[PDB]
Amino acid sequence: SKPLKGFVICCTSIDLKQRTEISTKATKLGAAYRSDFTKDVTHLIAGDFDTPKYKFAAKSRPDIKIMSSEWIPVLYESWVQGEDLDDGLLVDKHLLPTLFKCRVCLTNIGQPERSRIENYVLKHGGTFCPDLTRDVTHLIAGTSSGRKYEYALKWKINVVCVEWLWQSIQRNAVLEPQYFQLD
């Protein structure tokens, strides 16, 4: 009858057209839809991590599931084809990757730590960057010196300790950089 009864869905950094598609199909599935991020939101469909909505969910609402943009269209298509939906409602198969849109660079960290960090960045949906460029989102710095570090500061790129990575992975969300500032 209504597979998404009890769900309350909100979007962040989703283009208006795809937002209307999600809004209409989620409502058809029995969910409620919110344009504002209200207290009763249960699922946040996100197209970026650098938004006030994403940041609030990551900071304060671990109960809220952060979903990729194709979750509702895929779920809707399966239902409208009369396929049988299990209890999970495909939520786990369409969680947004933890490091979605992250481009991670490193400095002042030895081997074998460098190889391990790259492994986990890729495993959680991010891009690993051997060179620092202007579109790097996070520079993991073992200490606050060297050319990568100085130019990250010049270019206004986040500089964090490696605990940013481990705790973002454990939290299943990108955490804000000031929580992981050096010194």
Partner: peptide
């Protein structure tokens, strides 16, 4: 509960045009 934690992202203003792109090839 409809208390607003974070407001919806505002639709961007028209913004005065300052650049016209190279004609695509």
């Amino acid at each position: 509960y409809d208390s607003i934690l974070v407001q919806a992202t505002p639709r961007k203003s028209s913004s005065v045009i300052t650049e016209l792109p190279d004609t695509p090839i």
